[PDB]
Design a protein around this motif. Structure first.
Motif, PDB file in Angstrom:
ATOM      1  N   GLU A 106       0.818  -1.203   0.000  1.00 47.50           N
ATOM      2  CA  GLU A 106       0.000   0.000   0.000  1.00 47.50           C
ATOM      3  C   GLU A 106       0.856   1.260   0.000  1.00 47.50           C
ATOM      4  OE1 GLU A 106      -0.441  -2.619   2.193  1.00 47.50           O
ATOM      5  OE2 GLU A 106      -2.280  -3.385   1.272  1.00 47.50           O
ATOM      6  N   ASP A 107       2.037   1.209   0.642  1.00 47.90           N
ATOM      7  CA  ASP A 107       2.932   2.360   0.668  1.00 47.90           C
ATOM      8  C   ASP A 107       3.486   2.646  -0.726  1.00 47.90           C
ATOM      9  OD1 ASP A 107       2.753   2.551   3.513  1.00 47.90           O
ATOM     10  OD2 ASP A 107       4.173   0.898   3.674  1.00 47.90           O
ATOM     11  N   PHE A 108       3.806   1.592  -1.474  1.00 37.78           N
ATOM     12  CA  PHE A 108       4.290   1.767  -2.830  1.00 37.78           C
ATOM     13  C   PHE A 108       3.228   2.384  -3.727  1.00 37.78           C
ATOM     14  CE2 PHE A 108       4.471  -0.117  -7.123  1.00 37.78           C
ATOM     15  CZ  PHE A 108       5.680   0.401  -7.547  1.00 37.78           C
ATOM     16  N   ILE A 109       2.015   1.820  -3.696  1.00 39.71           N
ATOM     17  CA  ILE A 109       0.920   2.377  -4.477  1.00 39.71           C
ATOM     18  C   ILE A 109       0.693   3.824  -4.095  1.00 39.71           C
ATOM     19  CG2 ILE A 109      -1.547   2.167  -5.056  1.00 39.71           C
ATOM     20  CD1 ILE A 109       0.231  -0.024  -6.330  1.00 39.71           C
ATOM     21  N   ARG A 110       0.788   4.130  -2.794  1.00 40.98           N
ATOM     22  CA  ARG A 110       0.541   5.490  -2.338  1.00 40.98           C
ATOM     23  C   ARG A 110       1.571   6.481  -2.888  1.00 40.98           C
ATOM     24  NH1 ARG A 110       2.523   7.937   1.790  1.00 40.98           N
ATOM     25  NH2 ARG A 110       3.379   5.947   2.572  1.00 40.98           N
ATOM     26  N   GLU A 117       1.989  11.871  -3.525  1.00 38.50           N
ATOM     27  CA  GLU A 117       2.783  12.672  -4.454  1.00 38.50           C
ATOM     28  C   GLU A 117       3.736  13.635  -3.738  1.00 38.50           C
ATOM     29  OE1 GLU A 117       1.761  16.155  -7.504  1.00 38.50           O
ATOM     30  OE2 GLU A 117       1.300  14.173  -8.266  1.00 38.50           O
ATOM     31  N   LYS A 118       3.254  14.372  -2.730  1.00 37.72           N
ATOM     32  CA  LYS A 118       4.147  15.329  -2.076  1.00 37.72           C
ATOM     33  C   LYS A 118       5.337  14.619  -1.426  1.00 37.72           C
ATOM     34  CE  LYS A 118       4.291  18.580   1.822  1.00 37.72           C
ATOM     35  NZ  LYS A 118       4.367  19.968   1.276  1.00 37.72           N
ATOM     36  N   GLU A 119       5.067  13.537  -0.697  1.00 39.37           N
ATOM     37  CA  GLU A 119       6.129  12.728  -0.102  1.00 39.37           C
ATOM     38  C   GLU A 119       7.034  12.108  -1.161  1.00 39.37           C
ATOM     39  OE1 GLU A 119       4.661   9.647   2.425  1.00 39.37           O
ATOM     40  OE2 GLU A 119       6.667   8.796   2.726  1.00 39.37           O
ATOM     41  N   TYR A 134      14.075  13.375 -12.579  1.00 39.87           N
ATOM     42  CA  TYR A 134      13.161  12.347 -12.096  1.00 39.87           C
ATOM     43  C   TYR A 134      11.826  12.928 -11.670  1.00 39.87           C
ATOM     44  CZ  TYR A 134      17.512   9.957 -12.564  1.00 39.87           C
ATOM     45  OH  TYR A 134      18.716   9.526 -13.080  1.00 39.87           O
ATOM     46  N   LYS A 135      11.799  14.159 -11.139  1.00 39.83           N
ATOM     47  CA  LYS A 135      10.518  14.775 -10.808  1.00 39.83           C
ATOM     48  C   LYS A 135       9.686  14.995 -12.062  1.00 39.83           C
ATOM     49  CE  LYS A 135      10.932  17.361  -6.675  1.00 39.83           C
ATOM     50  NZ  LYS A 135      11.161  18.684  -6.034  1.00 39.83           N
ATOM     51  N   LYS A 136      10.330  15.401 -13.163  1.00 40.03           N
ATOM     52  CA  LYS A 136       9.596  15.560 -14.407  1.00 40.03           C
ATOM     53  C   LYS A 136       9.036  14.226 -14.877  1.00 40.03           C
ATOM     54  CE  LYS A 136       9.616  17.044 -19.111  1.00 40.03           C
ATOM     55  NZ  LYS A 136       8.192  17.322 -18.757  1.00 40.03           N
ATOM     56  N   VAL A 137       9.843  13.162 -14.820  1.00 42.36           N
ATOM     57  CA  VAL A 137       9.353  11.830 -15.185  1.00 42.36           C
ATOM     58  C   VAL A 137       8.184  11.426 -14.294  1.00 42.36           C
ATOM     59  CG1 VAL A 137       9.911   9.370 -15.327  1.00 42.36           C
ATOM     60  CG2 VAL A 137      11.482  11.075 -16.266  1.00 42.36           C
ATOM     61  N   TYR A 138       8.285  11.673 -12.985  1.00 38.66           N
ATOM     62  CA  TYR A 138       7.179  11.341 -12.083  1.00 38.66           C
ATOM     63  C   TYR A 138       5.902  12.027 -12.533  1.00 38.66           C
ATOM     64  CZ  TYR A 138       4.298  10.839  -7.901  1.00 38.66           C
ATOM     65  OH  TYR A 138       3.259  10.559  -7.038  1.00 38.66           O
ATOM     66  N   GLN A 140       5.087  13.224 -15.508  1.00 39.53           N
ATOM     67  CA  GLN A 140       4.589  12.723 -16.786  1.00 39.53           C
ATOM     68  C   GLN A 140       3.959  11.350 -16.622  1.00 39.53           C
ATOM     69  OE1 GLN A 140       8.599  13.127 -18.511  1.00 39.53           O
ATOM     70  NE2 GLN A 140       7.494  13.730 -20.361  1.00 39.53           N
ATOM     71  N   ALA A 141       4.601  10.471 -15.856  1.00 42.49           N
ATOM     72  CA  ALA A 141       4.221   9.062 -15.813  1.00 42.49           C
ATOM     73  C   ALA A 141       3.090   8.801 -14.828  1.00 42.49           C
ATOM     74  CB  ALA A 141       5.425   8.207 -15.415  1.00 42.49           C
ATOM     75  N   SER A 142       3.060   9.521 -13.717  1.00 42.40           N
ATOM     76  CA  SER A 142       2.113   9.183 -12.649  1.00 42.40           C
ATOM     77  C   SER A 142       0.639   9.113 -13.067  1.00 42.40           C
ATOM     78  CB  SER A 142       2.353  10.039 -11.386  1.00 42.40           C
ATOM     79  OG  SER A 142       2.197  11.413 -11.656  1.00 42.40           O
ATOM     80  N   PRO A 143       0.108   9.979 -13.928  1.00 39.81           N
ATOM     81  CA  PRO A 143      -1.311   9.791 -14.273  1.00 39.81           C
ATOM     82  C   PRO A 143      -1.572   8.439 -14.923  1.00 39.81           C
ATOM     83  CG  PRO A 143      -0.545  12.006 -14.841  1.00 39.81           C
ATOM     84  CD  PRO A 143       0.673  11.187 -14.567  1.00 39.81           C
ATOM     85  N   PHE A 144      -0.647   7.958 -15.755  1.00 38.90           N
ATOM     86  CA  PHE A 144      -0.810   6.657 -16.389  1.00 38.90           C
ATOM     87  C   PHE A 144      -0.569   5.523 -15.409  1.00 38.90           C
ATOM     88  CE2 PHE A 144       0.249   9.781 -19.543  1.00 38.90           C
ATOM     89  CZ  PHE A 144      -0.714   9.526 -20.525  1.00 38.90           C
ATOM     90  N   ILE A 145       0.448   5.656 -14.554  1.00 43.84           N
ATOM     91  CA  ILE A 145       0.765   4.618 -13.584  1.00 43.84           C
ATOM     92  C   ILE A 145      -0.384   4.451 -12.588  1.00 43.84           C
ATOM     93  CG2 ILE A 145       2.297   4.173 -11.610  1.00 43.84           C
ATOM     94  CD1 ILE A 145       4.621   5.086 -13.456  1.00 43.84           C
TER      95      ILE A 145
END
Ligand SMILES: [Cl-]
Length: 317
Positions: A106-110, A117-119, A134-138, A140-145
């Motif tokens: 659950e921590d990974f999914i979170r 996201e802030k953490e 890496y923040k830019k990649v996060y 870009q990728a997070s809505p799909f992930i």
């Protein structure tokens, strides 16, 4: 400082160092450096379970988190995540950092989710000298992930199977590899001349073998060229070692698995093939050979569930 040494023996630390230094290729930005590329759209990976479970040995795969699903089922000893798109390599690097820091699934999914996201971005900030890459990649990728994580949870319940995001033991197995430095994102083209050949040479040097190589449907984009033939022939393999791939053409012969419609409207049929068998096909010299032809000529098809085993061999013209 040896009190921060994560490996459980000198030998395992030496193996990890050797794996980490395997040769890589230079990647440059392309049109595929978008968030869409950082997730799988294959919704029936559970069909692979009886084929890949407990194969062990080394895992090599293109793509992203779906490799961790398959490697956990296989109990792979080490995982190479080899991709040619920089966003995929970097998103996998983020995933490994999140696994290291996330004690429970659950921590990974979170961390990948809106809630964390802030953490997550603060963790990236402290973990690199160039964290903005890496923040830019996060971002870009997070809505799909996030969407893919919610789909995976749905699929795991719909088809009643365990996978590393939904099962504590499989999560712990992947996290253990992450902590140990045994999940290695590396830059390489399937059609390149350095990285994939280099994996085989590295594994030969340390006396290990590939258990699974995962191509997704990447082979649908090319007829096999010489450099790919050489690199696959150069891989040390076990008798039981498998190729995993998907296809999305000739659905009359290779029907798309029930349930494929969640993430895509084109695909997929699943296919496994012993790597030794695949090496025969690649050595045969059939002009213009592609994965589809390998499956047409060599495949035994489950047309109900949409999965093929290529268990037959090339016949000489
Ligand atoms: Cl996935």
């Amino acid at each position: 400082k040896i009190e921060e040494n994560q490996n459980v023996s000198l030998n395992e630390g030496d193996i990890v160092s050797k794996l980490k230094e395997t040769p890589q290729e230079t990647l440059v930005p392309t049109k595929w450096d978008v968030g869409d590329t950082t997730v799988s759209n294959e919704d029936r990976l559970d069909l692979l379970i009886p084929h890949v479970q407990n194969l062990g040995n080394v895992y090599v795969g293109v793509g992203s988190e779906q490799n961790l699903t398959i490697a956990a089922w296989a109990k792979s000893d080490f995982i190479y995540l080899m991709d040619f798109t920089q966003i995929v390599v970097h998103a996998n690097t983020i995933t490994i950092l999140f696994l290291q820091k996330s004690e429970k699934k659950e921590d990974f999914i979170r961390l990948w989710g809106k809630e964390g996201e802030k953490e997550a971005l603060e963790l990236i900030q402290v973990s690199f000298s160039d964290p903005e890459v890496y923040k830019k990649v996060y971002k870009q990728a997070s809505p799909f992930i996030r969407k893919r994580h919610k789909t995976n949870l749905m699929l795991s319940k719909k088809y009643n199977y365990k996978m590393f995001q939904t099962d504590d033991e499989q999560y712990s197995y992947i996290r253990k590899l992450a902590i140990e430095g045994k999940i290695l994102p590396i830059r390489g083209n399937l059609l390149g001349n350095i990285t994939l050949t280099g994996i085989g040479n590295t594994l030969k040097k340390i006396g290990r073998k590939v258990g699974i190589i995962y191509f997704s449907n990447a082979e649908e984009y090319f007829a096999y060229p010489q450099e790919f033939k050489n690199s696959i022939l150069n891989l040390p393999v076990s008798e039981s070692s498998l190729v995993v791939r998907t296809i999305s053409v000739r659905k009359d012969l290779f029907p798309w698995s029930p349930g494929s419609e969640i993430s895509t409207d084109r695909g997929f049929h699943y296919c496994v093939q012993k790597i030794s068998n695949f090496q025969k096909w690649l050595s045969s010299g059939k002009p213009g050979l592609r994965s589809l032809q390998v499956m047409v000529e060599g495949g035994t098809v489950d047309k109900k569930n949409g999965i093929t085993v290529v268990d037959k061999e090339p016949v000489v013209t």
